[PDB]
Amino acid sequence: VTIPFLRKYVQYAKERVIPQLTQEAINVIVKNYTDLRDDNTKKSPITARTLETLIRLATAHAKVRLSKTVNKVDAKVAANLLRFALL
Amino acid sequence: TVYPLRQMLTDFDIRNINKLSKKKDIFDILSQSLAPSIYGHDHIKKAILLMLMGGVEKNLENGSHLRGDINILMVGDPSTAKSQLLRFVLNTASLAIAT
Amino acid sequence: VDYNNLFNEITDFLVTFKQDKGPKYMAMLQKVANRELNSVIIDLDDILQYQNEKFLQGTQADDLVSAIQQNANHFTELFCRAIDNNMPLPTKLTRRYFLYFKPLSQNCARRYISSKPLSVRQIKGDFLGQLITVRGIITRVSDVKPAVEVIAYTCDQCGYEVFQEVNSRTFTPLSECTSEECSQNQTKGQLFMSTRASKFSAFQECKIQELSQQVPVGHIPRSLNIHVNGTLVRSLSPGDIVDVTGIFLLEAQFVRQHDVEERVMELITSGDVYNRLAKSIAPEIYGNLDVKKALLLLLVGGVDKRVGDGMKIRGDINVCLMGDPGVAKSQLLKAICKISPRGVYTTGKGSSGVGLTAAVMKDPVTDEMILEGGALVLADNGICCIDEFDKMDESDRTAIHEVMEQQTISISKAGINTTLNARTSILAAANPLYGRYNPRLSPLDNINLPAALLSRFDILFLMLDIPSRDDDEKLAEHVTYVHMHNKQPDLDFTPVEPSKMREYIAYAKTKRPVMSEAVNDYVVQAYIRLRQDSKDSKFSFGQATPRTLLGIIRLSQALAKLRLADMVDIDDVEEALRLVRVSKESLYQPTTKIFTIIKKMLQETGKNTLSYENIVKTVRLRGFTMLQLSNCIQEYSYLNV
């Protein structure tokens, strides 16, 4: 919450835990990427690099909770961040 | 001789971060607790929290490495705190360079 | 190390040679006494044979090859006096000749080291004074200029002309008299210089560059300087690969220019060599076997044809990649430049205007006017790629079209009026006017490039993305599989490493296929029909040209070269025409036996389908090609069946 706590939180997550993928978070991000590849006809271009950035963030959330592997909710909060930053 | 090749951690702080590891309300209050002088913009600082923590930096076998870093561009009207958020991210990160 | 016995060995070597008229070195001295040549070439093979002859007779060897290799600058001034001690009488400062060296090859090295192919990154610093053989391309060369070696001064008071020796880049005029008569005198009279009695030399500087596949991962090909003198001054023409053997102060002495069978036979024996080599290169992307199949035919090159009457046509392909964003474009380009040798990545803007043509520039070290070079001169024989083709200017386009039509560039500017050749294959990546495509616009209006540019382009790939429900999931599954781990998908095929197909491309490039007459009558009929069909509406673009017919012939030659055949069959032309028609087909998103076969196919479901995938499947096992049945579809439509 305070200033000297989140620094220790971020460095312990950076040094100890590395997250890996699961089958529960591959399909929902495949569904989200194929559904957006809508935005091309309406408001924004979607590239191949964005595929990589759509799981980077998931991993991020999965390491914010410092779990050893990813979850479906990490891809869901990445899609929510995408809906706020794209629309 | 040439050899090519930061807060201290106690055992009390590891109990606090292990206690805060399984509650499913941690992310929103950690995103809201970074800048109390800036009203609103929760999802932008949610992405800024995910941005300053990092990625994984995967190095492929016998090939090129994979990008683990994330990049963020912020646009809008010049009335808000976009120039006031850089001082907070410069003073609260592990190491940061602002130009 | 002693000099008194080694000089005796040097003067005993040149008079006792019988291994390769008669005593050849004395005959060369007779030839220089006849005043017909000015260059002396000394090899280490004769030294090795003389050492073998002296060692087998029980005499002391007193090794020369381990002493010539270190400090050759002392040896070129020490053995020259031993050559100068004995000369035959002529029948037809006083150095009439020029002494040079050459090292021994690896064939004389294995048959009883000193001459290894060295990189400029493999110099280490401590090799300053060893003879080295460097391999590399030459980008910067200079003009031939006379550099003095000794300055001759003449006097009218004494008559004794003096000679001073210069060693550095600069010198000072010796106005004071240092003669043997002015020392014992009050008068110290003026001296003058002579440009005739002074010995000069044809000096030339050159910049050798590091080879493309010999540089490490991430590093750039740094340069090195070579200072040549004498008769070797015209043996270095820019735009080539050279092996330079010389001492390292670089004072060159001699220049030259240009397990495996199991590796090619195990790649051949797996079956379906063309499709395996197509799907093996760049497997981190999804699909597009046709575009990258033509990229396979592009990097294999083709056959250069010479008429032998003063006319050379191109034996190269140039491929355009026009597409909308979203699909990867730099990855295929990077994989083609990483697999193929001498691949140079370029850009649209920046220093591109000087990066495609010679750029005059002053040189500080030697202080002169040197001519810098672009991206078409270090990549001589290979793939030259252009990213963001429509972001360039007219100056880039006028030089790209000139090497696209024929391989010789000629430049006539205040610096020089000269020509230079560069056999390159142009790969281009472009985007339309509004980023993506437009179905309401014509392709002549969608593409901003003029008719002469894409008329010269034989293959243009409209890599257009269309959103779908079923096909997008495979691209998403493939990118999540390659981002999950570095491994490729579990198909029953293994991706081949770069060395094996690099060896296959180098082995297939020596093949020279010859077209037959049965394929000739199919080629001329397809060309007549294509010209009549191309010879004017909403979805139309361009027209049929003879350069496209020549490109079809070149692609058929490349397909025959990939099958390692001496002849061109009917299977290559029907594949090339299918390739050039499916290259533009994405915008919409011998007969009686075949008739009998169609009837047999009907004797099951009774279906009159328009396009076929399972009718043609019973034809290829028999012996007829895909083109004969293609006519059987259209002809027969006149039977209304």
Find out whether B45 and B92 touch, Cβ atoms under 8 Å: no
Residue type, position C424, single letter: T
- Count other C-beta atoms under 10 Å from residue B20's C-beta: 16
Find out whether A11 and B94 touch, Cβ atoms under 8 Å: yes
The burial class, CB within 10 Å (0-12 / 13-18 / 19+), for C413 is exposed
User: What span, in angstroms and rounded, lies between the C-alpha atoms of C115 and C245?
Assistant: 8
C281-287: Cβ within 8 A, 24+ apart: C281/C335, C281/C336, C281/C339, C281/C501, C282/C331, C282/C332, C282/C335, C282/C336, C283/C488, C283/C495, C284/C331, C284/C335, C284/C482, C284/C488, C285/C328, C285/C331, C285/C332, C285/C478, C286/C474, C286/C475, C286/C478, C286/C479, C287/C474, C287/C475
Q: How far is CA C596 from the centre of its chain?
A: 53
Q: Which residue has the tokens 């941690």?
A: B26
User: What span, in angstroms and rounded, lies between the C-alpha atoms of C316 and C404?
Assistant: 9
CB spacing of B63 vs C486 below 8 angstroms = yes
User: Domain C259-583 is classified in which CATH homologous superfamily?
Assistant: P-loop containing nucleotide triphosphate hydrolases (3.40.50.300)
Chains B–C, number of C-beta pairs less than 8 Å apart: 4
In 3D, which of A35, A43, B56, A51 has the Cα closest to residue C480?
A51
The burial class, CB within 10 Å (0-12 / 13-18 / 19+), for A5 is middle
Find the helix packing angle between C289-299 and C546-562, rounded to 10°. Answer: 90
Q: Give the resolution to one decimal, in Å.
A: 8.1
The reply to whether C21 sits in an annotated binding site is: no
User: What span, in angstroms and rounded, lies between the C-alpha atoms of C364 and A16?
Assistant: 54
- Which positions 30-89 of B are in contact with C (Cβ < 8 Å)? 60-61, 63, 66
Q: Which residues sit opposite C384 in a β-bridge?
A: C344, C426
Angle value at C-alpha C46, between C42 and C48, nearest 5 degrees: 120
User: What span, in angstroms and rounded, lies between the C-alpha atoms of C617 and C199?
Assistant: 82
- Count other C-beta atoms under 10 Å from residue C443's C-beta: 20
> Where do runs of H (alpha helix) occur along C269-347?
273-280, 289-299, 330-339
Judging contacts by C-beta atoms under 8 Å, the chain B residues touching residue A4 are 7
Q: Which residues sit opposite C257 in a β-bridge?
A: C242
User: What span, in angstroms and rounded, lies between the C-alpha atoms of C501 and C507?
Assistant: 9
Which of left, alpha, beta for C187 (phi over 0: left; psi -120 to 50: alpha)?
beta
- Which positions 320-339 of C are in contact with A (Cβ < 8 Å)? 325-328
CB spacing of A51 vs C328 below 8 angstroms = no
In 3D, which of C461, C455, C329, C327 has the Cα closest to residue C386?
C329
User: What span, in angstroms and rounded, lies between the C-alpha atoms of C330 and A87?
Assistant: 28
In 3D, which of A55, A66, A52, A81 has the Cα closest to residue B46?
A81
Tokens of B63: 């090939």
User: What span, in angstroms and rounded, lies between the C-alpha atoms of C58 and C56?
Assistant: 5
Q: Which residue has the tokens 């000139």?
A: C402
User: What span, in angstroms and rounded, lies between the C-alpha atoms of C334 and C357?
Assistant: 23
Q: What is the DSSP letter of C232?
A: G
Q: Which residues of A touch B (CB under 8 A)?
A: 1-14, 18-19, 52-53, 56-57, 59-61, 63-66, 77, 80-81, 84-85
Check CB contact of C469 with chain B, cutoff 8 Å.
Answer: no
CB spacing of A46 vs C326 below 8 angstroms = yes
Which of A23, A26, A32, A34 to probe the C interface (max C CBs under 10 A)?
Answer: A34
Nearest CA in chain B to A59: B55
User: What span, in angstroms and rounded, lies between the C-alpha atoms of C587 and B68?
Assistant: 37
Q: What is the DSSP letter of C365?
A: T
